[PDB]
Design a protein around this nucleic acid. Structure first.
Lengths: 49, 48, 378, 48
RNA sequence: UAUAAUAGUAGUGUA
RNA sequence: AGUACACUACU
RNA sequence: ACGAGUGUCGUACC
């Protein structure tokens, strides 16, 4: 699970206007949960060898 | 010198000692150096 | 993107305007301060902020009283530098000299008596951006890069910059790099020494050195800055000055510097304007030029201070071992790239690799890269 | 032919003119407020 | 026998 | 303000 | 004004 940064939620929750197609909110379940489940993307630089 | 027998070292350093001396070992030192009544057995090694 | 055709929608290429020094004026700090105050208060014509500039000149005026200004500054500096730790628990006391409330050397309070309230609000809200609005979808507005008129305007700006900045300073270079490493550079390569000497002889080096020194002086003065104090920053050039408007101290996070460049020149249209000139007004004895207010982060100021080294390295590296190149063109390109502290050139420097190398290659999908990835931000 | 200014260049000089401009950039020119959102957008787009 | 070693901080280049 | 691969500085 | 942006921001506040 990838945890979104606290400041990202801080400036996403204080917009006062809904975005047109919020990819972040769709995956975040309307900002209900900070974490997002990542399956096929092994993280950058972690599996170099 | 390369792979010089130890008996040859003894004979060169001590010509006065006769054959049938104490049996020199199977060791064939790469080189020998005699100075100040001291004999140095020198072996070359190329290894990490 | 939001494509703009208007020339007035341009953002500054270099956040600075430069004019040649005046040999007929003394380089003393007090004399330059007096001259700048008089020229600011002597501005003619009508404009939105011209009254504000004249009032600022009135605030920074010491009149015939000059000696006690030096005495005051020296007395404060002697006490300030006598202690390793910063002087605390003692409040700095303003001392009016004539029309100037001098708090520190080249630091003046906003004389609300001298300024009209409307003019002060215009200068602080609509010009310096201080206090604007309070605690609109649009798209990033960029200039039309393939427009014929926009490219013609850019070419004209570059030609004008090359015209103004290629003239010699009329003075022997005599700088640190030369006096200290000329023998080594000359013995390594004669041509490199000649190119470096030519760089030091032209107006590009003087302009960038003056801008670096002015930014260093601005950074030095801005630490003691208050909400009602505008500072004056000076460099070696006696015609280039900087107004440092009130802002937060540098030591705090996300601290920014607000400054405006002032250039005094004998004849109008004899200034290097890299798209950062607010207005050229007429004052006594010549023409004054005021640039638009510039707000910069501390990292951008650090790069600006370091910029002379970048400029020299870029010029010498591009001209190295190449007699077919004109040094003026290389210096013209380097002045702009060295002082580029915006992402507009960042969006162009990296894709150039892929585009040109795929063009030069045997098999490449350059069309796909240009269509789907190349995203200029001009 | 040279790229950024008139004149002729060697292939080594041509590659230098192609590749050096990348190093003219300044680190830390980004703003966190926007890059956070951009990186989140691209990650979540790929995941979706 | 082409294989045993690795203080802390900072900077730079690279993926 | 992370993973790895280095090089250079200071204690 | 300036910096950033096809994310509502920085821009000192009563």
């Amino acid at each position: 699970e990838l945890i979104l940064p606290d400041e990202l939620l801080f400036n996403l929750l204080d917009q006062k206007v809904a975005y047109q197609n919020d990819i972040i909110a769709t995956m975040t379940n309307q900002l209900n949960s900070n974490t997002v489940l990542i399956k096929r993307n092994w993280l950058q630089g972690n599996f170099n060898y | 010198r390369n792979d010089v027998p130890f008996i040859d070292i003894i004979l060169d350093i001590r010509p006065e000692v006769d054959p049938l001396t104490i049996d020199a070992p199977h060791i064939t030192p790469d080189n020998y150096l005699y100075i100040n009544n001291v004999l140095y057995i020198i072996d070359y090694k190329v290894s990490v | 993107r939001e494509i703009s055709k208007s020339l007035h929608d341009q953002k500054p290429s270099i956040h600075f305007i430069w004019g040649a020094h005046n040999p007929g004026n003394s380089n003393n700090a007090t004399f330059k301060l007096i001259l700048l105050s008089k020229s600011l208060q002597s501005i003619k014509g009508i404009s939105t902020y011209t009254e504000a500039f004249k009032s600022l000149g009135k605030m920074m005026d010491i009149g015939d009283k000059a000696i006690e200004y030096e005495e005051f500054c020296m007395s404060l500096k002697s006490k300030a530098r006598s202690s390793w730790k910063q002087i605390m628990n003692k409040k700095l006391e303003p001392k009016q000299i004539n029309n100037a409330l001098v708090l520190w050397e080249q630091q003046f309070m906003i004389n609300n008596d001298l300024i009209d309230k409307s003019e002060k609000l215009k200068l602080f809200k609509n010009f310096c951006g201080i206090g604007k609005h309070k605690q609109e979808v649009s798209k990033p507005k960029i200039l039309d890069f393939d427009d014929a008129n926009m490219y013609l305007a850019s070419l004209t700006m570059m030609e004008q910059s090359k015209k103004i900045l290629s003239k010699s300073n009329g003075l022997k270079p005599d700088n640190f790099i030369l006096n200290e490493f000329g023998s080594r550079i000359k013995d390594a390569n004669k041509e490199t020494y000649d190119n470096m000497h030519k760089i030091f002889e032209t107006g590009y080096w003087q302009c960038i050195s003056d801008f670096s020194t002015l930014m260093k002086n601005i950074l030095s003065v801005s630490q003691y800055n208050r909400h009602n104090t505008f500072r004056i920053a000076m460099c070696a050039n006696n015609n280039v000055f900087a107004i440092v408007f009130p802002s937060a101290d540098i030591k705090t996070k996300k601290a920014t510097v607000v400054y405006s460049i002032i250039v005094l020149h004998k004849e109008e249209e004899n200034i290097f304007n890299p798209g950062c000139l607010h207005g050229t007004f007429k004052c006594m004895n010549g023409y004054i030029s005021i640039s638009r207010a510039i707000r910069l982060d501390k990292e951008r100021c650090q790069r600006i201070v370091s910029s002379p080294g970048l400029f020299l390295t870029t010029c010498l590296l591009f001209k190295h071992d190449n007699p077919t190149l004109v040094m003026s063109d290389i210096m013209n390109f380097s002045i702009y790239t060295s002082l580029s502290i915006t992402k507009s050139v960042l969006s162009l420097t990296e894709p150039a690799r892929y585009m040109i190398m795929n063009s030069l290659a045997i098999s490449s999908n350059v069309k796909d890269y240009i269509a789907e990835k190349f995203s200029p931000y001009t | 032919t040279s790229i950024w200014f008139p004149g002729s260049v060697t292939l080594k000089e041509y590659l230098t003119q192609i590749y050096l401009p990348f190093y003219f950039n300044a680190k830390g020119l980004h703003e966190k407020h926007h890059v956070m959102v951009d990186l989140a957008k691209t990650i979540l787009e790929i995941e979706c």
